[PDB]
Amino acid sequence: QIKAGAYDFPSPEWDTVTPEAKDLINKMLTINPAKRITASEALKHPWICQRSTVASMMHRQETVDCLKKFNARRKLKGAILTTMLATRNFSARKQEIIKVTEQLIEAINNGCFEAYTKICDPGLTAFEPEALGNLVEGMDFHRFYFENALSKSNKPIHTIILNPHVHLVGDDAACIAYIRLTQYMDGSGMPKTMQSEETRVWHRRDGKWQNVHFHRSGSPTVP
Amino acid sequence: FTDEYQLFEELGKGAFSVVRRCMKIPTGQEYAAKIINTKKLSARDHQKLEREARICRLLKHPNIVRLHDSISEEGFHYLVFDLVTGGELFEDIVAREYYSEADASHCIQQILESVNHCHLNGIVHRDLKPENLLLASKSKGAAVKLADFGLAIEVQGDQQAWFGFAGTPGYLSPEVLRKDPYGKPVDMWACGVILYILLVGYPPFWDEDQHRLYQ
């Protein structure tokens, strides 16, 4: 909004503001700083230097009432410390990325390689603990875990996606970062939990969101 | 196997399989025996070999490598195929002293006959490529034979579906690259790529970057 200078003077409150006051605001809120009024020039603006004849002297109770709320919010949001709040009000576009990500995780958990190769780009690259610090390319590296473990092992696992954050980087590209919590049964039949942090880069190709790169840190997804 | 047939020289050997020239002594034949050390065969590999044998048993056609028998022993399963001696079609062509469109058309006619037979039996090969186009023998007019149904799928009539991303890059169809449901037409795209190569000797789609190739 700021970069676009996307402000206006909505009615009714602005209907009683003088044109000269709106004019001075316009000249200060000029996107191009080369064309923005300077401090010396503003001091000569009629609303400033001819206030007696230009500025309204009507009482603006609605401004006082609104300033009270503005001040109250400002004192509540006064962050004494760096505060980082998750995302919970997602647009439809961001929810689309969350959905396809969860569809991909679901396909992995169910060992459905057909769904995996449908959702993942053929040129997928990946950093993951299973790859020992190497960047792997294609489906080969991941095919091994489908053809063996993902369906061979018969034990219950529950996946949790914590605090997803989605960046929209163009109409057909997105980035998602989330914590992947996995509950599972270990060899001795005891319940365990493991954590991974995962980034997935998505590109909409042929009308379908597809995963072109991902980066896992922490634990490896196979128990 | 030794029961009826007789083994001879080795023609190849994979991870779990060894292939040798064979002969049905009772009938003076000569086949290719795929000797599988079942003790080395995994579970997922077991699933794919069951599929390939069932499909091969279902396809009986001159231009398709025929599966003649399947029999098991002590952790050792035998698959008796046709004996193919002529090698790759593409390798034979470069050795010829004359080669024209008529020769290419005679080849594609046989390839289409095999593809049509597969499709008529609800089977899609999905990996038509030069390595799978063999000549029955080194005879002057040997028959072209379609080979290796390890990626072949079984489809329901003309119903499209997503069977997975499989094939060889240079021969993959647009629908598979778009991640759309697909079926028999993927083989006809591959045929078109093969036909293009048979006429000028270079592929219609080529690029060092696979991403650009797929575009």
Short mmCIF file of C-alpha atoms in Angstrom, two decimals:
data_model
loop_
_atom_site.label_atom_id
_atom_site.label_comp_id
_atom_site.label_asym_id
_atom_site.label_seq_id
_atom_site.Cartn_x
_atom_site.Cartn_y
_atom_site.Cartn_z
CA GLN A 1 0.00 0.00 0.00
CA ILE A 2 2.77 2.45 0.91
CA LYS A 3 4.78 1.81 -2.25
CA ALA A 4 1.61 2.33 -4.30
CA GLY A 5 0.59 5.46 -2.38
CA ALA A 6 -2.74 3.69 -1.87
CA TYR A 7 -4.51 6.04 0.52
CA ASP A 8 -7.74 7.99 0.13
CA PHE A 9 -10.01 10.43 1.98
CA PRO A 10 -13.17 8.42 2.74
CA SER A 11 -16.48 10.07 3.55
CA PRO A 12 -17.95 11.27 5.86
CA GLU A 13 -15.06 12.33 8.11
CA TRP A 14 -13.02 13.77 5.22
CA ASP A 15 -16.00 15.67 3.77
CA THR A 16 -15.45 18.40 6.39
CA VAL A 17 -11.66 18.65 5.94
CA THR A 18 -10.50 21.66 3.95
CA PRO A 19 -9.10 21.21 0.43
CA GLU A 20 -5.87 22.89 1.53
CA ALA A 21 -5.23 20.28 4.24
CA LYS A 22 -5.86 17.46 1.77
CA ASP A 23 -3.54 19.25 -0.66
CA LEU A 24 -0.67 19.42 1.83
CA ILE A 25 -1.08 15.71 2.62
CA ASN A 26 -1.01 14.90 -1.09
CA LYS A 27 2.24 16.83 -1.56
CA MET A 28 3.87 15.07 1.40
CA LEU A 29 2.60 11.61 0.42
CA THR A 30 4.14 11.86 -3.05
CA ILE A 31 5.57 8.46 -4.03
CA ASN A 32 8.48 9.98 -5.96
CA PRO A 33 10.75 11.62 -3.35
CA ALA A 34 12.13 13.99 -6.00
CA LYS A 35 8.65 15.53 -6.35
CA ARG A 36 7.77 15.47 -2.64
CA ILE A 37 7.36 18.79 -0.87
CA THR A 38 10.31 19.77 1.32
CA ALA A 39 10.19 21.08 4.88
CA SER A 40 10.97 24.62 3.69
CA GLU A 41 8.18 24.48 1.11
CA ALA A 42 5.57 23.04 3.49
CA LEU A 43 6.28 25.87 5.93
CA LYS A 44 5.03 28.20 3.17
CA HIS A 45 1.90 26.18 2.35
CA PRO A 46 -1.28 28.25 2.91
CA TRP A 47 -2.66 25.73 5.41
CA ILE A 48 0.51 26.24 7.49
CA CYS A 49 1.51 29.90 7.07
CA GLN A 50 -2.03 31.28 6.53
CA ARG A 51 -3.73 28.99 9.05
CA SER A 52 -5.94 31.83 10.31
CA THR A 53 -7.74 32.03 6.95
CA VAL A 54 -7.29 28.51 5.54
CA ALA A 55 -7.52 25.92 8.31
CA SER A 56 -10.96 25.03 9.62
CA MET A 57 -11.76 25.82 13.25
CA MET A 58 -14.57 23.27 13.54
CA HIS A 59 -14.33 20.72 16.35
CA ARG A 60 -13.48 17.20 15.15
CA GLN A 61 -14.84 15.00 17.93
CA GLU A 62 -14.71 11.96 15.66
CA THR A 63 -10.97 12.56 15.29
CA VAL A 64 -10.56 12.70 19.08
CA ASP A 65 -12.62 9.53 19.54
CA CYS A 66 -10.61 7.73 16.85
CA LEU A 67 -7.27 8.98 18.19
CA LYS A 68 -8.19 7.52 21.59
CA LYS A 69 -8.49 4.10 19.95
CA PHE A 70 -5.35 4.67 17.87
CA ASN A 71 -3.39 5.52 21.03
CA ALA A 72 -4.81 2.55 22.94
CA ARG A 73 -3.87 0.08 20.19
CA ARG A 74 -0.43 1.68 19.91
CA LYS A 75 0.22 1.16 23.63
CA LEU A 76 -1.01 -2.44 23.50
CA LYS A 77 1.12 -3.33 20.46
CA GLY A 78 4.15 -1.63 22.04
CA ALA A 79 6.48 -4.62 21.74
CA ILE A 80 9.07 -4.38 24.50
CA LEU A 81 10.75 -7.45 22.97
CA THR A 82 10.97 -9.02 19.53
CA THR A 83 7.69 -10.93 19.15
CA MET A 84 7.17 -13.42 16.31
CA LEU A 85 3.56 -14.51 15.77
CA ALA A 86 2.64 -17.37 13.45
CA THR A 87 0.33 -17.06 10.44
CA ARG A 88 -3.30 -18.12 10.86
CA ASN A 89 -5.40 -15.93 8.49
CA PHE A 90 -4.48 -17.34 5.08
CA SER A 91 -5.68 -16.17 1.69
CA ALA A 92 -7.13 -18.74 -0.68
CA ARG A 93 -3.87 -18.67 -2.66
CA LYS A 94 -1.78 -19.55 0.41
CA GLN A 95 -4.20 -22.29 1.48
CA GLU A 96 -3.74 -23.79 -1.98
CA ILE A 97 -0.02 -24.21 -1.25
CA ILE A 98 -0.75 -25.72 2.16
CA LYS A 99 -3.20 -28.18 0.60
CA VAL A 100 -0.88 -29.48 -2.12
CA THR A 101 1.94 -29.71 0.43
CA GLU A 102 -0.23 -31.88 2.68
CA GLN A 103 -1.30 -33.94 -0.34
CA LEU A 104 2.40 -34.55 -1.03
CA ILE A 105 3.16 -35.53 2.58
CA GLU A 106 0.12 -37.82 2.52
CA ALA A 107 1.38 -39.56 -0.62
CA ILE A 108 4.76 -40.11 1.05
CA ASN A 109 3.19 -41.56 4.20
CA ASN A 110 1.00 -43.87 2.11
CA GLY A 111 3.90 -44.86 -0.16
CA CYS A 112 2.03 -43.74 -3.29
CA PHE A 113 4.82 -43.07 -5.77
CA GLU A 114 2.33 -42.31 -8.56
CA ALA A 115 0.94 -39.37 -6.59
CA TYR A 116 4.47 -38.31 -5.65
CA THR A 117 5.64 -38.15 -9.28
CA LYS A 118 2.41 -36.34 -10.20
CA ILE A 119 2.98 -33.59 -7.63
CA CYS A 120 6.79 -33.32 -7.88
CA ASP A 121 8.58 -31.79 -10.83
CA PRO A 122 10.78 -34.24 -12.78
CA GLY A 123 13.75 -31.93 -12.17
CA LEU A 124 13.15 -31.80 -8.43
CA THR A 125 16.24 -31.07 -6.32
CA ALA A 126 16.52 -31.74 -2.61
CA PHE A 127 18.64 -31.21 0.47
CA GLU A 128 17.72 -33.75 3.14
CA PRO A 129 19.47 -35.66 5.94
CA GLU A 130 19.04 -38.89 3.96
CA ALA A 131 21.29 -37.30 1.30
CA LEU A 132 24.20 -36.57 3.69
CA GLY A 133 24.65 -32.93 2.71
CA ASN A 134 24.46 -33.56 -1.05
CA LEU A 135 22.03 -31.91 -3.43
CA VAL A 136 20.14 -34.73 -5.15
CA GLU A 137 18.26 -34.33 -8.43
CA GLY A 138 15.36 -36.23 -9.94
CA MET A 139 13.12 -38.95 -8.58
CA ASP A 140 15.73 -41.72 -8.30
CA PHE A 141 16.93 -40.90 -4.78
CA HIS A 142 13.35 -40.76 -3.49
CA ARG A 143 12.20 -43.85 -5.40
CA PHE A 144 14.24 -46.05 -3.06
CA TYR A 145 12.17 -45.13 0.01
CA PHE A 146 8.88 -45.78 -1.81
CA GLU A 147 9.89 -49.11 -3.36
CA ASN A 148 10.98 -50.33 0.08
CA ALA A 149 10.19 -48.74 3.44
CA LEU A 150 7.21 -46.46 2.86
CA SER A 151 4.92 -49.43 2.10
CA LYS A 152 6.98 -52.36 3.44
CA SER A 153 6.88 -51.27 7.09
CA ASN A 154 3.54 -51.87 8.84
CA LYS A 155 3.51 -49.48 11.81
CA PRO A 156 1.28 -46.49 12.63
CA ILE A 157 2.63 -42.98 12.07
CA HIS A 158 0.95 -39.59 12.59
CA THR A 159 2.20 -36.43 10.88
CA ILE A 160 1.65 -32.92 12.23
CA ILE A 161 2.35 -29.70 10.31
CA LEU A 162 3.18 -26.82 12.66
CA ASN A 163 3.24 -23.10 11.91
CA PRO A 164 3.27 -23.14 8.09
CA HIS A 165 4.43 -19.90 6.48
CA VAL A 166 3.74 -19.32 2.78
CA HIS A 167 5.46 -16.75 0.56
CA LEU A 168 3.68 -15.87 -2.67
CA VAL A 169 6.43 -14.96 -5.14
CA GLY A 170 4.40 -14.28 -8.27
CA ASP A 171 1.15 -15.60 -9.65
CA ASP A 172 2.62 -19.05 -10.41
CA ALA A 173 5.31 -19.48 -7.73
CA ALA A 174 5.23 -19.98 -3.98
CA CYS A 175 7.40 -21.00 -1.04
CA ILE A 176 6.25 -22.84 2.08
CA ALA A 177 8.15 -23.43 5.33
CA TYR A 178 6.83 -25.57 8.16
CA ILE A 179 7.77 -27.85 11.02
CA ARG A 180 7.02 -31.53 10.42
CA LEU A 181 6.28 -33.45 13.62
CA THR A 182 6.08 -37.23 13.23
CA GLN A 183 4.77 -39.62 15.88
CA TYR A 184 5.59 -43.28 15.27
CA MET A 185 6.27 -46.64 16.91
CA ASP A 186 9.93 -47.56 17.34
CA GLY A 187 11.47 -51.03 17.07
CA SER A 188 10.64 -51.92 20.68
CA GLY A 189 7.03 -50.87 20.07
CA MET A 190 7.44 -47.67 22.10
CA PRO A 191 5.96 -44.36 20.91
CA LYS A 192 8.44 -41.77 19.69
CA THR A 193 8.35 -38.32 18.13
CA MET A 194 10.77 -36.67 15.72
CA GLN A 195 10.99 -33.21 14.20
CA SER A 196 12.04 -31.93 10.80
CA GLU A 197 12.05 -28.43 9.35
CA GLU A 198 11.08 -28.35 5.69
CA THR A 199 11.06 -25.81 2.88
CA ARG A 200 9.22 -26.57 -0.36
CA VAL A 201 9.35 -24.37 -3.47
CA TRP A 202 6.28 -24.61 -5.69
CA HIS A 203 5.81 -23.67 -9.35
CA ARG A 204 2.42 -23.72 -11.08
CA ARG A 205 3.10 -25.52 -14.36
CA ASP A 206 0.30 -26.51 -16.75
CA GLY A 207 -2.26 -25.38 -14.18
CA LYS A 208 -0.89 -27.63 -11.41
CA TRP A 209 1.22 -26.66 -8.42
CA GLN A 210 4.40 -28.74 -8.57
CA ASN A 211 7.32 -29.11 -6.17
CA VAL A 212 10.61 -28.12 -7.80
CA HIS A 213 12.86 -28.10 -4.71
CA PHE A 214 12.74 -28.93 -1.02
CA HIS A 215 15.10 -28.69 1.93
CA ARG A 216 14.71 -30.84 5.06
CA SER A 217 16.71 -30.24 8.23
CA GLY A 218 16.49 -32.15 11.49
CA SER A 219 15.39 -35.77 11.55
CA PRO A 220 15.02 -37.98 8.46
CA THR A 221 11.40 -38.68 7.57
CA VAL A 222 11.80 -42.47 7.64
CA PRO A 223 11.69 -43.42 11.38
CA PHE B 1 13.59 -76.54 -16.62
CA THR B 2 16.42 -79.01 -17.28
CA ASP B 3 13.43 -81.35 -17.03
CA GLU B 4 12.56 -80.59 -20.67
CA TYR B 5 14.90 -77.93 -22.07
CA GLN B 6 18.70 -77.63 -22.20
CA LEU B 7 20.82 -74.60 -21.30
CA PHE B 8 23.83 -73.25 -23.20
CA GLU B 9 25.86 -70.05 -23.62
CA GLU B 10 25.06 -66.91 -21.63
CA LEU B 11 23.51 -63.98 -23.50
CA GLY B 12 23.45 -61.60 -20.53
CA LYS B 13 23.12 -61.29 -16.79
CA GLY B 14 21.42 -58.68 -14.61
CA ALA B 15 21.12 -58.23 -10.86
CA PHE B 16 18.71 -61.12 -10.22
CA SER B 17 18.59 -62.73 -13.68
CA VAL B 18 20.88 -64.56 -16.10
CA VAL B 19 19.86 -65.25 -19.71
CA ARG B 20 21.20 -68.13 -21.81
CA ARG B 21 20.53 -69.70 -25.18
CA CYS B 22 18.27 -72.70 -24.67
CA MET B 23 16.83 -75.62 -26.62
CA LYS B 24 13.69 -77.71 -26.16
CA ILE B 25 15.33 -81.09 -26.75
CA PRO B 26 11.92 -82.80 -27.25
CA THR B 27 11.20 -80.55 -30.26
CA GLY B 28 14.62 -79.30 -31.43
CA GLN B 29 13.67 -75.68 -30.76
CA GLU B 30 15.85 -72.81 -29.53
CA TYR B 31 14.72 -70.17 -27.02
CA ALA B 32 16.11 -67.58 -24.61
CA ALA B 33 15.80 -68.67 -20.98
CA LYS B 34 15.59 -65.94 -18.32
CA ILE B 35 16.92 -67.70 -15.22
CA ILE B 36 15.83 -65.79 -12.11
CA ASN B 37 17.57 -66.43 -8.79
CA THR B 38 14.35 -66.01 -6.82
CA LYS B 39 16.37 -65.80 -3.59
CA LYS B 40 17.71 -62.40 -4.73
CA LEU B 41 14.32 -61.05 -5.88
CA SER B 42 12.89 -58.41 -3.54
CA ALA B 43 9.19 -57.88 -2.85
CA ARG B 44 8.72 -54.85 -5.11
CA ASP B 45 10.78 -56.55 -7.82
CA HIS B 46 8.60 -59.63 -7.33
CA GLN B 47 5.53 -57.46 -7.99
CA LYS B 48 6.92 -56.09 -11.26
CA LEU B 49 8.06 -59.46 -12.64
CA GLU B 50 4.62 -60.94 -11.95
CA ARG B 51 3.16 -58.09 -14.01
CA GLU B 52 5.63 -58.43 -16.90
CA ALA B 53 5.05 -62.19 -17.21
CA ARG B 54 1.26 -61.89 -17.10
CA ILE B 55 1.40 -59.25 -19.85
CA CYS B 56 3.84 -61.23 -22.00
CA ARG B 57 1.67 -64.35 -21.70
CA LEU B 58 -1.27 -62.27 -22.96
CA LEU B 59 0.50 -60.94 -26.09
CA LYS B 60 0.91 -63.43 -28.97
CA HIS B 61 2.03 -61.58 -32.09
CA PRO B 62 4.84 -61.93 -34.67
CA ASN B 63 6.30 -58.49 -33.87
CA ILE B 64 6.24 -59.02 -30.08
CA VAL B 65 8.80 -61.03 -28.12
CA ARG B 66 6.76 -64.07 -27.12
CA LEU B 67 6.83 -65.61 -23.64
CA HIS B 68 6.68 -69.35 -24.31
CA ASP B 69 6.72 -70.86 -20.81
CA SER B 70 6.99 -70.06 -17.11
CA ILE B 71 8.03 -72.69 -14.56
CA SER B 72 9.51 -72.65 -11.06
CA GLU B 73 12.05 -74.78 -9.19
CA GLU B 74 13.98 -74.48 -5.91
CA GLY B 75 14.08 -70.71 -5.55
CA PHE B 76 14.72 -70.39 -9.28
CA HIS B 77 12.01 -69.35 -11.75
CA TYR B 78 12.44 -69.81 -15.51
CA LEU B 79 10.93 -67.62 -18.24
CA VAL B 80 11.31 -68.91 -21.80
CA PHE B 81 11.28 -66.09 -24.37
CA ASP B 82 11.85 -66.03 -28.10
CA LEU B 83 15.50 -66.10 -29.12
CA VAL B 84 16.32 -62.72 -30.68
CA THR B 85 19.62 -62.63 -32.58
CA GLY B 86 19.39 -59.57 -34.85
CA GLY B 87 20.09 -56.95 -32.20
CA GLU B 88 18.78 -53.40 -32.36
CA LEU B 89 16.90 -52.25 -35.45
CA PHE B 90 18.73 -48.91 -35.30
CA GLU B 91 22.12 -50.67 -35.25
CA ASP B 92 21.18 -52.79 -38.27
CA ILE B 93 20.12 -49.73 -40.29
CA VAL B 94 23.50 -48.00 -39.98
CA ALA B 95 25.15 -51.16 -41.33
CA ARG B 96 22.94 -51.26 -44.43
CA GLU B 97 24.26 -50.03 -47.78
CA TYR B 98 20.81 -48.80 -48.89
CA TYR B 99 18.05 -47.26 -46.75
CA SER B 100 14.99 -45.27 -47.86
CA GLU B 101 11.55 -44.19 -46.69
CA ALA B 102 10.14 -47.50 -47.92
CA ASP B 103 12.47 -49.32 -45.53
CA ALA B 104 11.46 -47.00 -42.69
CA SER B 105 7.77 -47.47 -43.50
CA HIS B 106 8.14 -51.26 -43.47
CA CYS B 107 9.70 -50.95 -40.01
CA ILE B 108 7.04 -48.63 -38.59
CA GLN B 109 4.33 -50.85 -40.08
CA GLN B 110 5.60 -53.71 -37.91
CA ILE B 111 5.99 -51.45 -34.87
CA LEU B 112 2.43 -50.19 -35.35
CA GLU B 113 1.22 -53.78 -35.71
CA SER B 114 2.73 -54.62 -32.32
CA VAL B 115 1.45 -51.42 -30.68
CA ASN B 116 -2.01 -52.05 -32.12
CA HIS B 117 -1.95 -55.59 -30.72
CA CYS B 118 -0.92 -54.30 -27.29
CA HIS B 119 -3.66 -51.67 -27.30
CA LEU B 120 -6.26 -54.16 -28.54
CA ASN B 121 -5.39 -56.29 -25.49
CA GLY B 122 -5.66 -53.36 -23.07
CA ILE B 123 -1.90 -52.96 -22.64
CA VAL B 124 0.23 -49.81 -22.92
CA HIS B 125 3.98 -50.24 -23.30
CA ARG B 126 4.92 -46.70 -22.13
CA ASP B 127 8.61 -47.11 -23.07
CA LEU B 128 8.80 -47.44 -26.85
CA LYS B 129 12.39 -46.57 -27.75
CA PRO B 130 15.21 -47.84 -29.98
CA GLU B 131 16.60 -50.18 -27.30
CA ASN B 132 13.26 -52.05 -27.33
CA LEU B 133 13.06 -52.47 -31.14
CA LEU B 134 14.93 -55.67 -31.98
CA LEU B 135 15.35 -57.87 -35.05
CA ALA B 136 14.39 -61.53 -34.69
CA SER B 137 17.59 -62.65 -36.42
CA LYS B 138 20.40 -61.44 -38.67
CA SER B 139 18.49 -62.80 -41.67
CA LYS B 140 18.16 -60.35 -44.53
CA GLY B 141 14.46 -59.76 -43.83
CA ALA B 142 14.13 -60.60 -40.14
CA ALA B 143 11.04 -59.33 -38.31
CA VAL B 144 11.02 -56.32 -36.00
CA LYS B 145 10.03 -57.40 -32.49
CA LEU B 146 8.86 -55.20 -29.62
CA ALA B 147 10.64 -56.06 -26.38
CA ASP B 148 10.79 -55.36 -22.65
CA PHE B 149 7.36 -54.76 -21.10
CA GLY B 150 8.86 -53.91 -17.70
CA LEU B 151 7.07 -50.54 -17.72
CA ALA B 152 3.88 -51.80 -19.38
CA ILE B 153 0.54 -51.13 -17.71
CA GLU B 154 -2.91 -52.71 -17.91
CA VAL B 155 -5.66 -50.24 -18.79
CA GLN B 156 -9.45 -50.52 -18.65
CA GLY B 157 -10.69 -50.13 -22.21
CA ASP B 158 -10.20 -46.49 -23.20
CA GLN B 159 -10.23 -45.08 -19.66
CA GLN B 160 -7.53 -42.50 -18.95
CA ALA B 161 -5.72 -42.32 -15.62
CA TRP B 162 -2.47 -41.19 -14.02
CA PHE B 163 -0.27 -44.30 -13.91
CA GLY B 164 2.85 -42.40 -12.85
CA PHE B 165 5.75 -40.52 -14.43
CA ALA B 166 7.52 -43.24 -16.43
CA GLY B 167 9.29 -43.50 -19.76
CA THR B 168 12.44 -42.23 -21.43
CA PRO B 169 12.77 -38.41 -21.57
CA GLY B 170 13.20 -38.00 -25.33
CA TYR B 171 10.07 -40.08 -25.98
CA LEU B 172 7.74 -38.87 -23.20
CA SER B 173 4.36 -37.54 -24.32
CA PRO B 174 3.03 -34.04 -23.59
CA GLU B 175 0.21 -35.43 -21.45
CA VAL B 176 2.62 -37.24 -19.13
CA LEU B 177 4.80 -34.13 -18.88
CA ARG B 178 1.70 -32.06 -18.06
CA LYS B 179 0.88 -34.61 -15.31
CA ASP B 180 -2.47 -35.37 -16.96
CA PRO B 181 -4.23 -38.75 -17.00
CA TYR B 182 -3.10 -40.71 -20.03
CA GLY B 183 -3.35 -44.03 -21.83
CA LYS B 184 -2.74 -45.68 -25.20
CA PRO B 185 -1.89 -42.44 -27.09
CA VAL B 186 1.41 -42.11 -25.19
CA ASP B 187 2.73 -45.00 -27.29
CA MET B 188 1.70 -43.28 -30.52
CA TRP B 189 3.63 -40.15 -29.55
CA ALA B 190 6.69 -42.34 -28.99
CA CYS B 191 6.09 -43.93 -32.40
CA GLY B 192 6.08 -40.45 -33.93
CA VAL B 193 9.42 -39.70 -32.28
CA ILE B 194 10.81 -43.00 -33.56
CA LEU B 195 9.48 -42.35 -37.06
CA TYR B 196 11.10 -38.90 -37.11
CA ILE B 197 14.45 -40.46 -36.16
CA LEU B 198 14.08 -43.23 -38.75
CA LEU B 199 13.86 -40.61 -41.51
CA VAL B 200 16.70 -38.17 -40.74
CA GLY B 201 18.62 -39.90 -37.96
CA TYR B 202 18.29 -37.28 -35.21
CA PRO B 203 15.52 -36.70 -32.65
CA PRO B 204 12.79 -34.06 -33.05
CA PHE B 205 13.20 -32.91 -29.42
CA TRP B 206 16.70 -32.53 -27.96
CA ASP B 207 18.32 -30.23 -25.42
CA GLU B 208 21.14 -30.48 -22.89
CA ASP B 209 18.77 -29.15 -20.21
CA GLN B 210 16.03 -31.69 -19.51
CA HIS B 211 13.68 -28.93 -18.34
CA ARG B 212 14.02 -27.22 -21.72
CA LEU B 213 13.58 -30.57 -23.49
CA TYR B 214 10.27 -31.11 -21.69
CA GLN B 215 9.13 -27.59 -22.58
#
